[PDB]
Structure 1
Amino acid sequence: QATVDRLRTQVTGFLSGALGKLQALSAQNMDPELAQFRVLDVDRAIMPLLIVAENARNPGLNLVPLHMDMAEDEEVRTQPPMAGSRHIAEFVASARPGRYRAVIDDGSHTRAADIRKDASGTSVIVVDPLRKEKDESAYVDYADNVNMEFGEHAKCAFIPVDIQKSFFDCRILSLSLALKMHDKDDAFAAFHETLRNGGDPSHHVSRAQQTEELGATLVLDGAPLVDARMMKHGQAASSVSRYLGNHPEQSTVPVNKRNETLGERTTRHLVKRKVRNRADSEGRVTSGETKEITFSNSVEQKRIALLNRAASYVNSAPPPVVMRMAKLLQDSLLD
């Protein structure tokens, strides 16, 4: 039992505190892991709040946090699902018909999804910001996995994209992807219709095939559906230029109101700094706990901007919203 004012203060205060530390880190060009800042915990705690705020800020976004079987297994999962997360199967069984965006936690990793549910069934287009498998055939498995959690009869597309390079940025990247899905609501709706009618997907995406076991549509190249604006937070310059080299038509479109192309915006966000030394693609790692790399800042800045937005939202939100957010934060910090 506490007043609305107190609760409001605890929610914006949490958000502001996170913001303070992240902004300090970013301004000093420090890696959070090396600085021993618990990014995973904070991201997990702020995400429900960000989702509430973004849903209010963009009517029709309809973003929902979902999780899979493994996310309920204490022995395997990296951390519990965020506060207010619902199991995919419970959502598909019980949600009202309509159009949703989702962030889906598989127990270790979070992806974005655009979901359409109606009386004739459910379809989902999953966009994974991480593309870490050397062997692309691996993704057949992934596609099947997501499909069998939505149910055999749900139509599913799985689209892995080479955006994420860190171990922790999946949640913010997925949130951003969901915002972009909403932004491209029509194009994703067109793909949904195509999935449901069992049509030719080659008009929507560049590389696609159905899996043998579940008939899920695995999309190994999602352009032009995955367009330039969805690649804005790509952390490796090499990933962005490989994308643009593969889809030159994407290289000339403005990705913001500053009229930057993808290439230009990415180069503006390049920073150089120390991160924990980790193995590369073929699993080779040098000696020493750290390595210096050059990568794009963009996701860092995004997290900070989203936190600003959410704090602003909470500062003026009606009492029921404040009480809902306070309960989400309280349930988060229980971990």
Structure 2
Amino acid sequence: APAGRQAGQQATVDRLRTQVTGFLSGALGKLQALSAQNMDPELAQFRVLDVDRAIMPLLIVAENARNPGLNLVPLHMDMAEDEEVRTQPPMAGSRHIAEFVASARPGRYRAVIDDGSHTRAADIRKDASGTSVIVVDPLRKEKDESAYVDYADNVNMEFGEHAKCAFIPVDIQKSSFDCRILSLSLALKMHDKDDAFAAFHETLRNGDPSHHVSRAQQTEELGATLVLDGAPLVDARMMKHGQAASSVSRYLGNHPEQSTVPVNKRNETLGERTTRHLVKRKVRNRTSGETKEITFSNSVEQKRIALLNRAASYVNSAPPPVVMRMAKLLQDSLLD
């Protein structure tokens, strides 16, 4: 019974519980309906950017509780604090990296890093020796691979010049609004490959990345690591939600050994699973005009739905202090 754990607040708790599940499940029902009807959300006038920003802090709480040791913390870069450049304010509970590095208790963390307009995933190690970070970006649209040099340097400068850093840009995202669900999934995959990421942190502080990645280079300015080929650290299980079939196939062509390993309990290969998620629909054009018809994997929209399902279930059976916390995180999203 929960009457013992309610501290006489069963009225406020029970009402905040309904309020949070109502929003999570309310978003779930529309997204499930749009996905089942094979319709693009932004063409259907669903404001995914705002829903993804409001549910994210609540998803992390659920994921942190579902997998202890994930230690997933939302963080943002300095440019995210600038109301002039940013397209959206950082999500509720988000911390400035400088504040985090200075005050975070030593240990292992996962993170989603908002720069104001885009979000990446990260694996952070903080101890006496220093802080080290492995950043995986689900977007790779830069035409010339020199912006990644800047990104790697820009990420290192945000964590401190004494931090060891690796920047891994990966061709997963194709849409404009999926960078939050993709980064959240990469974080979960990081905790899944915890051992492999710890051995990379070790090599970062000490030799040859060849035991961990296929292609890497130190940057001229800060000597941070830029990885333009993350395999095998970036394996098939990290490429599952690649939206373009050409990205998954190019990746498998470059790393054939990843084409036969199981990516889930159903024993699907990366290629089998992506094919199962291929849909054909109209999307917004980013000549002429407005829309274009494409064939892509709806894995991310299915994953957004599956994550909302998890969170809504967690809250239904969550203890009051968790309910209070998630209700506040939702209210805090209407600030800024």
TM-score of the pair, normalised by structure 1: 0.96
Deviation, 1:134, is 1.2
Deviation, 1:333, is 2.6
- Show the 5 A alignment for 1:176-325: 176-197=185-206, 199-277=207-285, 286-325=287-326
CA deviation vs aligned residue, 1:211-253 (integer Å, no higher than 9, x gap) = 0101110000000000000000000000000000000000000
- Show the 5 A alignment for 1:103-114: 103-114=112-123
CA distance in 2, matches of 1:215, 1:13: 48
CA deviation vs aligned residue, 1:234-281 (integer Å, no higher than 9, x gap) = 00000000000000000000100111100010000000000111xxxx
- Show the 5 A alignment for 1:107-186: 107-186=116-195
CA distance in 2, matches of 1:190, 1:11: 39
CA distance in 2, matches of 1:334, 1:142: 29
CA distance in 2, matches of 1:297, 1:327: 32
CA distance in 2, matches of 1:2, 1:207: 57
CA distance in 2, matches of 1:69, 1:138: 18
CA distance in 2, matches of 1:290, 1:4: 45
Name the SS of the counterpart of 1:273 in structure 2. Answer: strand
CA distance in 2, matches of 1:162, 1:150: 24
CA distance in 1, matches of 2:124, 2:335: 30
Counterpart in the other structure of 1:282: none
CA distance in 2, matches of 1:70, 1:210: 24
CA distance in 1, matches of 2:133, 2:305: 29
CA deviation vs aligned residue, 1:166-223 (integer Å, no higher than 9, x gap) = 11100000000000000000000000000011x1112210110000101110000000
Q: Quick check: 254-263 or 2-11, which moved more?
A: 2-11
CA distance in 2, matches of 1:81, 1:48: 10
Deviation, 1:165, is 0.3
CA deviation vs aligned residue, 1:70-89 (integer Å, no higher than 9, x gap) = 11111110100000000011
* 1:225–1:3 distance in 2 versus 1, CA, 3 Å: same
Name the SS of the counterpart of 2:134 in structure 1. Answer: strand
Deviation, 1:19, is 0.3
Aligned alpha-carbon RMSD (Å): 1.0
CA deviation vs aligned residue, 1:123-153 (integer Å, no higher than 9, x gap) = 0000000000111122000100011000100
TM-score of the pair, normalised by structure 2: 0.96
CA distance in 1, matches of 2:260, 2:218: 32
CA distance in 2, matches of 1:24, 1:217: 43
CA deviation vs aligned residue, 1:27-61 (integer Å, no higher than 9, x gap) = 11111111111000000000000000000000100
CA deviation vs aligned residue, 1:71-130 (integer Å, no higher than 9, x gap) = 111111010000000001100100011100000001110000000000110000000000
CA distance in 1, matches of 2:327, 2:288: 45
Name the SS of the counterpart of 1:84 in structure 2. Answer: coil
Counterpart in the other structure of 2:109: 100
Deviation, 1:334, is 3.0
Identity %, equivalent residues: 100
* 1:2–1:146 distance in 2 versus 1, CA, 3 Å: farther
Q: Quick check: 120-129 or 134-143, which moved more?
A: 134-143
Name the SS of the counterpart of 2:30 in structure 1. Answer: helix
Deviation, 1:287, is 1.3
CA distance in 2, matches of 1:169, 1:181: 18
Deviation, 1:2, is 6.2
Name the SS of the counterpart of 2:11 in structure 1. Answer: coil
CA distance in 1, matches of 2:334, 2:66: 25
Deviation, 1:288, is 1.9
CA distance in 2, matches of 1:89, 1:316: 35
- Runs of 4+ in structure 1 deviating by more than 4 angstroms, as ranges, are none
Gaps of 5+ in 2: 1-9
Aligned length: 326
Gaps of 5+ in 1: 278-285
